[PDB]
């Protein structure tokens, strides 16, 4: 897993950003679910960008593939 | 956003054997996008339900309200 130390940084940033006038309290279960989701989603999207990498017969993932991925799934 | 090596560890989980140096920054952008959407949706639902606290179920609502999560 990733550490909570920098993750809750960003969770707080975005709770504050879209809160609608009261900072929105965010239970422990919510935090754990967000962390789990982001970890497996990043694993997933890295694997798919690396599928693009493999598709062009090179083994080194680079921003070429990351950017094609960004185009595919916004 | 993400540490430095945690990006590497997630890459190595994903079957990525070699990584470019720019990737981390790009990866961070990706994370910022994803979470930023999720939290948004979750907060909004918590805001519609007239509750003060984001919950695991609100996270589930936000994830489900994505569609492109799978591929």
């Amino acid at each position: 897993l990733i550490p909570k130390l920098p993750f809750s940084r960003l969770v707080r940033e975005f709770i504050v950003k879209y809160s609608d006038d009261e900072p929105l309290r965010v239970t422990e279960g919510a935090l754990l679910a967000m962390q789990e989701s982001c970890e497996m989603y990043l694993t997933q999207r890295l694997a798919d960008s690396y599928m693009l990498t493999k598709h062009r017969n090179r083994v080194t993932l680079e921003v070429r593939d990351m950017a094609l991925m960004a185009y595919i799934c916004d | 956003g993400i540490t430095k090596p945690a990006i590497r560890r997630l890459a190595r989980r994903g079957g990525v054997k070699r990584i470019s140096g720019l990737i981390y920054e790009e990866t961070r952008g990706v994370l910022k996008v994803f979470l930023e959407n999720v939290i948004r949706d979750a907060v909004t639902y918590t805001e519609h339900a007239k509750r003060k606290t984001v919950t695991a179920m609100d996270v589930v609502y936000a994830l489900k309200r994505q569609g492109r999560t799978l591929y």
Partner: peptide, 30 residues
């Protein structure tokens, strides 16, 4: 095969939560 794994993970997230926080007032303790 991805969809099944995500649906499992979401079924998991359906579990206990407790510990309401006031994000900034809490996150000092993270």
């Amino acid at each position: 095969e991805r969809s099944k794994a995500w649906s499992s993970k979401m079924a998991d997230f359906a579990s206990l939560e407790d510990g309401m926080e006031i994000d900034v007032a809490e996150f000092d303790n993270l």
